Subunit: 336 residues, 4 copies
């Protein structure tokens, strides 16, 4: 459950389409269908007219948000059972199917646009598919390196499997087919990150306000996701406090920061100022690798949580107002 | 957050005490302070604490009104929180962020456990690793589908000083801990929490925030020092073939639907499937993992009590239990 | 807000159309676009509108998933406070969403809740009680608040009235008066009453301020554009009379259980419904028949929410069975 | 209900006492038990209650954490509730339903009032009628647009044993009441609660549940015995012509944009307009004169709603932060 933003999605996999209504994004935010469609396209190319497109039904005029609810519709074009008493599990799968994640990505696309206005960037990349892992990423020191993270995301965009090293593509494509010929499905793991998130988002005062918990629900709620780690995660539970602890640093023109990021950008339920890093595990599908698409949905979920948490801290009804409060707050952080 | 129950905790680590208010538990539920104190003691034992019921209970039974609890303090997030709340006197945040707050959580959880027991639902847990030392016997997770095994591990854990399923290894672990403590070092750990006899159908796939897996993930990860959470096999499942993770569906007269394995941890597509709910939680170093496991039980009880009430609704046990029976028969007879 | 149901509406007055998403209605509830349009039309006559079901319904029945509706604004070919609030220099951006046109989406959502409610024998209706200084005299005495037959009858006649007044015969007196005031540079507001029949006792709760059914109905009604006043039962009049005068004496009978001899309380006691007709009086300031139709929708939403809150359930059969078990429990208490 | 603040109250009429937890009040707000007790006393005189702060306050200031309050119970409807919760002993319902619960609401309301005072927002009320007897001088509601008059009526009311704006009429009302008492009768009443210096922009028109009027209506109508609520003129406005109801808009250099009258009650289109917020509340006869006490609870409820709406608009975790945003916003208002 979000604290500031509100949204609902609807639609069955084989129905007229998917509908979503997002409320809470401030007024005067430049927003276009192309920005939304771009994200929908990344998710589509993650499974391996046909292109998903969203039509804005309200909330936007002359390229800017009005401040009113934003409604989107995604045509399908190709146009549980016990709990709801549905003998035909089709009615259950229709709505359950990962088809619904497309609406999540559309809502997330709006949140990403909102976040970018504050210089906040979200990205991701696959680190393992089946038993084959991206060995270059076993050392997690890059969790504290914005340039590297961004670098890996950029390369993932040039990968048919969204892996940080496209050259490895052919190699991975081999292992995959080598497995799909044995009538076997594959799972995977990806990492999602957010850069330039100021310290102070989320809160330690109540269990449900902790940023980590919120991130956890958003990620684990994605279909097929069975595991989630913030930063080092389970590996951190096997190490010594000293080999996990992120050393605190400070500078005159920068304020406080950390020398490493094993915590994944959060400390005691609140963001660190360091990159937010989340590791997500997707179990093998059914029985067309889906981990790449999953990672794109992961970015959408993280953008929703962060946009929500940022608005919770800043408040505001129009961009000029929110941006001013962000600037004052960041100034307060730097000089603390 | 929750979908049916509502609660809030308050109090600083070194203040007068911890306060908690829980709303939504049906009326006529036998409840006593000992049942609460029992859980509070298990928490401290994992590293004197009692709770006084201030309202919501009369003649040993809930009135259906809000239940207020107070845990008197006998001895009467840092930095980021300091920046966040403009608190120069850092102790102002550390005070509320302290794991002492988890005591109020366990207090609330205790009431939820009692509620759940009325339906035969049992919650338990045990530590599987501390630092680099793991309980090798528990390496194979086949026991995720075995209610008897899970329960026995919990029971034995209650006799372990570190809540490990094999008390005879306490010295082997204690030596390791004392050893790491010899140096200037702290340790984290990993525990598994489970719920038995939970009916399929809890939670929902209709909306991302209603899926039971996300709700379990938030509750668990909201616990102090927790940095990782898995439902069932977890990250391990992500590395296997589809056929090695799949929990084949089985059915028999009377027993109804069930699964031959539980790599999924008791949930499928955002809803409980009838199998034991199993959650793996990773705690980073700050020893404290045993107390964390107890807190994990409380969080799981709260999420499940909430999910059960969301499905059944009702204002008094008699009413809620009748609905449970009809639903269960509906499940089997499906 | 709501305790079980969840919904959101969107759309600008002159945009492409109105959108709404409703979540929480049980599966297997018969639902058609015609049942929705029926209400949408009643709303317009209060001053075409057609709703397309985009999801949640298959083979005429609800799937249990979210129900999305779209009301296409076919001719697609206040202000200051919102302008300041949202930094909207062009106040049209505030007007487009604030417009009473938005109420159509609320009526569409309400229509679904009405159908859900009807599956339980619960009926929702309304009628106009006054417009300007002209009030319906025959209804001065509020004794009919405890008479389901009368309330239902007044609603029926209203359905034949151009201004939804409970006495079609008075249509001309009202229309004439309206034209007179309209002949001048003036506009009128009005009062209407909304009721719900066959609602069981126990809906809502007294344990927490935000769960009391009276506060929930009040927000729903007052949220309607131009509504400045709301009362449950006698309302402000009850505040003027003596205790013994407003008090609804409790009655009981073998084959009917507990009930009340009068309904000055409007079907609510201490935060809970008491079994009597739920009656709400609503005041709309100048610039009412259409508003009364919106009032029905809002009361349907709140009651459907309160019903599901008490019963739970994911499919009609399940809910209806818990209903019967609950009602029997009430009678034999 | 609320969108920013969160709180819960608990306790039975004759139990050990009343408990409450309020979350969301910013850090560094001066707060003492006497500020709370003062409000608790006003309530008692409306028919020594004292609250004990158990957390959320250190050195006279809020820490930013949840605020817990306990109100001792020294002495340490029913049917519908008895049926709903299957309680054969109707004393189990009366104990919680009892207007005794309002004491907890007033304690919560006190903290909110203090918060609101930091911004110059003032909340008050006064009784306008008891039984068939109403304060004639208040028949004309033109004083809704007069901050000074309203405040005056409230101060005068504080000198009345029936919180009526005209203390001289006390004996007059006392007798009338006494006469009604003789023939074994109970009386209801009508009071008006106002809020001064509230800026335009609180609440929203974008979604039904965000509109300020609706939020005020639930808060008020949720008070025991309340059967009616009006914002401004109310039902009387429904009986008037548009021109004799609408508040014409005026503009000036200072405090730009204002209204010439306040028939609307300080809200329009679901948003506060800067004018005084005025609510008229009707309380039925209890059971088969508590209207003065009811007015004090009405104040607490309006304060909670407004503090929540103000926080919703401003956001913020500490007072210095919230105050600058308020200043900036008001600056935006005056120059719009």
């Amino acid at each position: 459950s979000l604290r500031y933003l509100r949204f609902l999605t609807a639609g069955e996999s084989h129905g007229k389409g998917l509908t979503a209504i997002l409320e809470g994004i401030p007024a005067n935010l430049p927003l276009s269908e192309e920005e939304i469609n771009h994200e929908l396209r990344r998710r589509q190319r993650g499974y391996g007219i046909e292109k998903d497109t969203a039509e804005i039904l309200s909330g936007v005029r002359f390229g800017k948000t009005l401040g009113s609810p934003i409604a989107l519709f995604i045509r399908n074009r190709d146009w549980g059972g016990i709990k709801y008493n549905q003998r035909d599990l089709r009615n259950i799968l229709e709505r359950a199917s990962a088809r619904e994640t497309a609406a999540r990505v559309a809502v997330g696309a709006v949140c990403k646009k909102f976040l970018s206005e504050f210089g906040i960037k979200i990205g991701s990349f696959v680190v393992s598919i089946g038993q084959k892992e991206v060995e270059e990423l076993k050392d997690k020191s890059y969790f504290a390196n914005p340039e590297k993270l961004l670098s890996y995301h950029e390369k993932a965009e040039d990968s048919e499997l969204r892996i940080p090293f496209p050259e490895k593509d052919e190699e991975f494509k081999t292992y995959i087919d080598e497995v799909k010929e044995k009538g076997e499905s594959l799972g995977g793991v990806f990492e999602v990150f957010a850069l330039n998130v100021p310290p102070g988002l989320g809160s330690h005062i109540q269990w449900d306000r902790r940023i980590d918990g919120r991130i956890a629900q958003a990620m684990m709620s994605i279909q097929a996701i069975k595991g989630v780690e913030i930063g080092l995660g389970f590996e951190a539970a096997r190490r010594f406090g000293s080999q996990v602890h992120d050393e605190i640093g400070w500078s005159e023109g920068k304020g406080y920061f950390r020398h490493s990021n094993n915590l994944g950008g959060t400390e005691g339920g609140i963001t660190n100022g360091m990159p937010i890093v989340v590791r997500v595990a997707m179990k093998p599908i059914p029985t067309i690798v889906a981990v790449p698409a999953a990672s794109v949905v992961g970015e959408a979920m993280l953008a929703i949580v962060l946009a929500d948490a940022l608005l919770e801290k800043l408040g505001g009804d129009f961009m000029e107002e929110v941006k001013k409060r962000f600037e004052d707050y960041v100034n307060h952080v730097k000089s603390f």
